[PDB]
Write a protein that binds this ligand. Structure first.
Ligand SMILES: Nc1nc2c(ncn2[C@@H]2O[C@H](COP(=O)(O)OP(=O)(O)OP(=O)(O)O)[C@@H](O)[C@H]2O)c(=O)[nH]1
Ligand SMILES: Nc1nc2c(ncn2[C@@H]2O[C@H](COP(=O)(O)OP(=O)(O)O)[C@@H](O)[C@H]2O)c(=O)[nH]1
Ligand SMILES: Nc1nc2c(ncn2[C@@H]2O[C@H](COP(=O)(O)OP(=O)(O)O)[C@@H](O)[C@H]2O)c(=O)[nH]1
Ligand SMILES: [Mg+2]
Lengths: 176, 50, 48, 436, 426, 426
């Protein structure tokens, strides 16, 4: 399970070495002057399978690196100026949204807290953020499986992160 | 009592149809929510590129 | 007993119908958001 | 692509007598055998192949037998308006009636006529080339329909087996009835039809009375009206084979699409638009409202409420001027309708067939002449309800052993009574498990 | 001199190919009697691709018609331009199968394909240098899907180095016409993804909405629903028959549109599309034709093409134009919609032109896109298949014909993996 | 080249635009069939400011008809010059606002703007160099006052650097045709003050007085009023279409007549409007044109200029004149009426001359004045708004349609401060 471009480089280079050894064995066989091309095609198809697996691992690593580096930026947003204290509070709210909202009551409570916090500024983004908060609140109050409120929760989290990554809303975002 | 039981059965089936329709609509709603998420991610990326 | 049961099922169906109506209005609003997002992304890409 | 018809019992004979009238009227065959040589209505010399057979100098004979023990109705036909049309030996008349006695129609008297019936059915099949199956008509509340019908279904399955069997069975009604041994005969025919009839579609005189009272405004209908409109239904079902359309089907497809299980084939029929002659030029005819009328709960040929259960597979056979776009839209609307529900065992449960042929009403009839008509055949789970309401009265009768001395003196004991009762119970269990 | 053999199977295949043959015969300028009447000289120069002279101008089309029910051949022979197909090319059984992939692919695939292969082999060896096979059929039927698929496997085994263009119409979610649609679709896909060179998939509600909006027809019947597909089928084969600034054959299209041999399910378009009322108020030029091509409500598949990226796309233009503005328009579309185009390929769009527009017009185009948004047309069928197979509903009609549950498991696995790799490339 | 796209809204907008296109079509020589049937070469030189070339000399207007009821659309189609428009532009919701501003700005606007915006965007992208948008609407109806201003706001947010010149026919106090006129007009000007760019004010009472006295008409139908408004439109849009000894485009007129960004409600006239019993008697010269120009009883508004000082004035003449004569006439008027002109603005009059007078005539002129006398037209609507808001009359039909109770107060506040800002600079 890779996470670094260096480890991906290692995987790529060892795969290329494997390709070279396989084709060298095929060539040094020195036989099947008509099945040689079929063996070459099969070898290339094997290569394609492995490259697609590497691509899948790359997608997973990119997503996990994105999440980890957002958390890292939130941490660097903390390391006792009042702006940094507000940043720590917003980090707490973001972690509350991040954690698996396994309980509907705590879900509603944290949504209430973040709605109170957001409703202070109200220029353009809070309209859609409040709309999404009310959407989740209603679809939990009437009673629907939270496992079906996955994309909507993702959208709330994304909009809240975009709200945090803003100068006026978080009065230190000029850093990044 | 016979007519009342018939009405009970009809109303019960109507309620179950409503439930299944809501389930299907919720699935479609979640798919559209994924779509909105993707179209917002692309917009943020393009803004940063600009 | 049967009259009580009919009352119960009528209430349940009413609740489900209201849920469906709210979900439909949400879906239409999301479609409008789809259109506006597409337009905004187009314009920003052209500026880029 | 020919299908032969066999008509068993009084109800079957009368229904067939109406059906062959309608068919001869359609294909222009005169009531004396040959098509006129001066007036040429319609087209297609292969259009009459399915139901008739040409002989020599234009004398057509139908591919249908009329078998019965009691000779009354059979010789009434023999002396009636349809003398020349039928072959003289396709009409089989015994001597003594089965007389509401399933045993007397299945064991003692039956065995002496089925041999002749089969010896002629196989002759008819040999004359035919593209045999598409068999269609049977029988009243399960009688003696010839149940006994003779069960025996003949058994022997036809033993002989051919691999061909389809569409059976239009007249079950009794909830309250309307004209016997006392209806439950006994009906269950003893159910046990055999359940595992031999390839597709069993049900009828009910009470339901057809309701239909022809509300729609045709005939408040006092006899059996002729019921037979006429059932003939209309059969013609609408066979229109796909007999003519050409934008999207045509046949029997093989009809089973392949509407029978989700080897033992679940009990499907409600219906027809639309059932309209009198005084309102046909008032009401607007289009696929949306005719489909709604066909799906209307009090328009089922079987007196059972279809909202109770979940549909399995619906076949809408449209006839006349239909352009598939509007039937698709009507299909979407009817699937979005709130009161009807499907089952997750079948996500897509519609099938639409279309033929370019308007329905034909028999002169002096009651139905009006129209442009288009939909015949609907849907598999549902309220047939469990009809079987249950029959089973209650059957076991209530079997409590006191009433009317059973006739059976024990004619040739069956109580072993197969218990067997058929358990079989019907298993059928009800099957329906109740599958539906939900 | 390059030769295409056109096979048509099932009711869908029969009707669609009949419309295609009327359009092509009219465009090359031959009357239904069977003689030639093309005034120009550009028409005789390439009749050999679709027609063979029999004796004295009787240019018989090169086509194979196959199904199991007599009615379809009766209708085709009766219909206009149906007096030209050679009767010996009506290779045909007698019974009819109906909605049963297993019945049409196992039983009758024995006593009918044994002669269909003979007819195809004779017709192919009749010509000098083959170009490929062009076969039109459906996926939700029995006599076109299973029979056509077994024919595809047989002809791929026979002729390995030949193009294969499968014009296949796929079942629709909303447009319910039978219940065995998921079964037949999965079974057919399980072999198309294995053997078919490329599948130009089509459906029905997309075409219905096209006839509603882009043409404003009020009662769109099959006679025009298939006319659109006939126009597309004629327009794809433009280079093999007509000169132009930049010729491009089926091999060229496959090379430019198939990054991997399991990525060959194209969605198709056609421009211009306009109502007869407004055929007087619009300007016929590449700037409008290209915008019509790159539209969601203009494609002929129920997959919203923005729901993903385009792995590759192709445009085939017909009519005098400027290959500067054609290329500029293609690049403009790429740059404007860079979000909906995959990144690891530059110039995802190929554009080839020809100097001959279709008869009755002055300019035309055709769009062939291999995009990952076509995954939904398979996802819906896969989910329906899973829901139905969890209950073994309608299963006995296959199990008593000869098919087992292993075939269904394999079909589901291949369907899921190809959809998963479409999702990967996004 | 520089472009104007014409959006018509509501019943009044549809009728006015229909008459205006009837007028411009003959001013350029275009046959109502659609073809060109002119006489002079110089007509063709700028017909791309209003038209498109469809197929072989089929010049079609660049207009979008926008409304919620199809009755007026049917009437326009029936009327003459109907077969000139592109039927695609025809957009309508078929339900009807019913003179309900909230319904037309919140209920049906949200469902029909999604298409009308698409159409106007299509016209804009078919253009190459956009000068701006032209709009026609009313301020007393549901669609005209609500959906028109909603579309104006949409256009301003989309294209922020393109002008909009909009002809707004306003509800005069004594020719009222409905009861919610101020509730509509105030709410519409709420957004017209901050979105539009030139709100050219018109009213039917002044047109009625003109038809009574100057034209001496006895029974003036709406056709003649629409003709007068069309003449004003053509007079404004003439430097864009014909050469002249001086040039004044839309942007130049705006930048000259708008000193402060909230004073863009111009009031206009037209010369020479001659009764057909005096046209044979009067000899038309530049002094006659300027006399009828500054004649207060000819201005197409119920805002008498004797009560207000002029901030700016413009005169667009059409005809081969003497530029010294025109300028000295402007000077003479400015020196005679020495009290009606702002002291801190020297030479308040800007005059442009085009070389091609309108059809038939040999000399013409159009007056566009930005004076402070117009604030009477706003006082007379603010008073009525306060009158029907003091006891909450007719509020629920807007309250329950989507609007709150504070938008009306905001509209009243903007009326009050707008009147205050004219009073300040009077
Ligand atoms: N709907 C309808 N029912 C009919 C018709 N003819 C007979 N029946 C019904 O058939 C049912 C039972 O059949 P029977 O009348 O006993 O005649 P059968 O089936 O030949 O039995 P047996 O005559 O006793 O041998 C009766 O209850 C009738 O209601 C008919 O034309 N239409
Ligand atoms: N566009 C189009 N679709 C058709 C036509 N005929 C049938 N279909 C569709 O094709 C699907 C299945 O085709 P089918 O009739 O089973 O083909 P078969 O195997 O030859 O019978 C159905 O959903 C029909 O809606 C046609 O002529 N044109
Ligand atoms: N100039 C002119 N004004 C008109 C015409 N028809 C109506 N009006 C004016 O328009 C006002 C009514 O606007 P209305 O049609 O209700 O606007 P809508 O609700 O958006 O359609 C009335 O006060 C009339 O004076 C016309 O043909 N010409
Ligand atoms: Mg009898």
């Amino acid at each position: 399970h890779p996470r670094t471009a260096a480890d991906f480089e290692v995987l790529y280079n060892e795969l290329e070495a494997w390709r070279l050894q396989e084709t060298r064995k095929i060539k040094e066989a020195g036989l099947a002057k008509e099945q040689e091309q079929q063996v070459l095609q099969q070898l290339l198809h094997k290569e394609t399978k492995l490259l697609q697996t590497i691509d899948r691992l790359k997608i997973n690593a990119n997503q996990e690196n994105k999440e980890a580096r957002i958390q890292h930026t939130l941490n660097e947003m903390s390391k006792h100026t009042p702006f940094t204290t507000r940043a720590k509070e917003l980090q707490q709210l973001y972690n509350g949204l991040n954690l698996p909202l396994l309980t509907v009551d705590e879900r509603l409570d944290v949504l209430l807290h973040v709605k109170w916090t957001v409703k202070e500024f109200d220029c353009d983004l809070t309209r859609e953020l409040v709309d999404l908060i009310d959407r989740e609140a209603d679809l939990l109050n009437r009673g629907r499986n939270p496992k079906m409120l996955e994309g909507l929760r993702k959208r709330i989290s994304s909009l809240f992160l975009n709200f945090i990554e803003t100068p006026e809303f978080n009065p230190e975002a000029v850093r990044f | 009592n016979e007519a009342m039981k018939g009405e009970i059965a009809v109303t019960r089936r109507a309620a179950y149809a409503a439930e299944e329709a809501v389930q299907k609509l919720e699935k479609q709603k979640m798919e559209q929510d994924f779509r909105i998420d993707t179209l917002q991610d692309n917009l943020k990326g393009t803004q940063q590129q600009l | 007993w049967n009259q009580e049961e009919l009352e119960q099922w009528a209430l349940a169906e009413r609740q489900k119908a209201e849920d469906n109506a709210a979900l439909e209005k949400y879906r239409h609003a999301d479609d409008g958001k789809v259109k506006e997002l597409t337009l905004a992304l187009e314009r920003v890409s052209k500026q880029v | 692509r020919e299908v032969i018809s066999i008509h068993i019992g009084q109800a079957g004979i009368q229904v067939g007598n109406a059906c062959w009238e309608l068919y001869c009227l359609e294909h222009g065959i005169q009531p004396d055998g040959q098509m006129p040589s001066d007036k040429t209505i319609g087209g297609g010399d292969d259009a009459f192949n399915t139901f008739f057979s040409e002989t020599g100098a234009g004398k057509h004979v139908p591919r249908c037998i009329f078998l019965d023990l009691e000779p009354t109705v059979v010789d009434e036909v023999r002396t009636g308006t349809y003398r020349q049309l039928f072959h003289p030996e396709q009409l089989i008349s015994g001597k003594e009636d089965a007389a509401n006695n399933f045993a007397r129609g299945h064991y003692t008297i039956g065995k002496e006529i089925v041999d002749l019936a089969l010896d002629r059915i196989r002759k008819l099949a040999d004359n035919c080339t593209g045999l598409q199956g068999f269609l049977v008509f029988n009243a399960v509340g009688g003696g010839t329909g149940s006994g003779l019908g069960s025996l003949l279904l058994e022997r036809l399955s033993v002989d051919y087996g691999k061909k389809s069997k569409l059976g239009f069975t007249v079950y009794p009604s909830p309250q309307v009835s004209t016997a006392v041994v209806e439950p006994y005969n009906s269950v003893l025919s159910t046990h055999s039809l359940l595992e031999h009839t390839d597709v069993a579609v049900m009828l009910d005189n009470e339901a057809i009375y309701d239909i022809c009272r509300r729609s045709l405004d005939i408040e006092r209908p006899t059996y002729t009206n019921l037979n006429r409109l059932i003939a209309q239904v059969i013609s609408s079902l066979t229109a796909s084979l007999r003519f050409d359309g934008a999207l045509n089907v046949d029997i093989t497809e009809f089973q392949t699409n509407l029978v989700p299980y080897p033992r679940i084939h009990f499907m409600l029929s219906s027809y639309a638009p059932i309209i009198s002659a005084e309102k046909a030029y008032h009401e607007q005819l289009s696929v949306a409202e005719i489909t709604n009328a066909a799906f209307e709960p009090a328009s089922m040929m079987v007196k059972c409420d279809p909202r109770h259960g979940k549909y399995m597979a619906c076949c809408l056979m449209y006839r006349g001027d239909v352009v598939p776009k509007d039937v698709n839209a009507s299909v979407a609307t009817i699937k979005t309708k709130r009161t009807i529900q499907f089952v997750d065992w079948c996500p897509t449960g519609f099938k639409c067939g279309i033929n370019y042929q308007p329905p034909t009403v028999v002169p002096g009839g009651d139905l009006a002449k129209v442009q288009r008509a939909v015949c609907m055949i849907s598999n549902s789970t309220a047939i469990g309800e009809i079987f249950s309401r029959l089973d209650h009265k059957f076991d209530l009768m079997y409590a006191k052993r009433a009317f059973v001395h006739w059976y024990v003196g004619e040739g069956m004991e109580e072993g197969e009574f218990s067997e058929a009762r358990e079989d019907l119970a298993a059928l009800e269990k099957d329906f109740e498990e599958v539906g939900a | 001199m390059r030769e295409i053999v056109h096979i048509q199977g099932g009711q869908c295949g029969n009707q669609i190919g009949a419309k295609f043959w009327e359009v092509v015969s009219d465009e090359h300028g031959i009357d239904p009697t069977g003689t030639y009447h093309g005034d120009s000289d550009l028409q005789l120069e390439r009749i050999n691709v679709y027609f063979n002279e029999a004796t004295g101008g009787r240019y018989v089309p090169r086509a194979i018609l196959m199904d199991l029910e007599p009615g379809t051949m009766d209708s085709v022979r009766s219909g206009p331009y149906g007096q030209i197909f050679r009767p010996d090319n009506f290779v045909f059984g007698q019974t009819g199968a109906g909605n049963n992939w297993a019945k049409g692919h196992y039983t009758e695939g024995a006593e009918l394909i044994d002669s269909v292969l003979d007819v195809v082999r004779k017709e192919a060896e009749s010509c000098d240098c083959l170009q490929g096979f062009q076969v039109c059929h459906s996926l939700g039927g029995g006599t076109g899907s299973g029979m056509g698929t077994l024919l595809i496997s047989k002809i791929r085994e026979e002729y390995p180095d030949r193009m294969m263009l499968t014009f296949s119409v796929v079942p629709s979610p909303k447009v319910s016409d039978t219940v065995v649609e998921p079964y037949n679709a999965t079974l057919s896909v399980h072999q198309l993804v294995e053997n078919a060179d490329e599948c130009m998939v089509l459906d029905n509600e997309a075409l219905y909405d096209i006839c509603f909006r882009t043409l404003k027809l009020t009662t769109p019947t099959f006679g025009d629903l298939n006319h659109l597909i006939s126009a597309v089928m004629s327009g794809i084969t433009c280079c093999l028959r007509f000169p132009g600034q930049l010729n491009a054959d089926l091999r060229k299209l496959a090379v430019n549109l198939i990054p991997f041999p399991r990525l060959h399910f194209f969605m198709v378009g056609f421009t211009p599309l306009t109502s007869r009322g407004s055929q007087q108020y619009r300007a016929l030029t590449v700037p409008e034709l290209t915008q019509q091509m790159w539209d969601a409500k203009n494609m002929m598949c129920a997959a919203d093409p923005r729901h993903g990226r385009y792995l590759t796309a192709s445009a085939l233009f017909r009519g005098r134009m400027s290959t500067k503005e054609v290329d500029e328009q293609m690049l403009n579309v790429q740059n404007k919609n860079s979000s909906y185009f995959v990144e690891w390929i530059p110039n995802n769009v190929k554009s080839s032109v020809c100097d001959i527009p279709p008869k009755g017009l002055k300019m035309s185009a055709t769009f062939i896109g291999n995009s990952t948004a076509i995954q939904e047309m398979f996802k819906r069928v896969s989910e329906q298949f899973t829901a139905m197979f969890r209950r073994k509903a309608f299963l006995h009609w296959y199990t008593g014909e000869g098919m087992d549950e292993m075939e269904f498991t394999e079909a589901e696995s291949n369907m899921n993996d190809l959809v998963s790799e479409y999702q990967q490339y996004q």
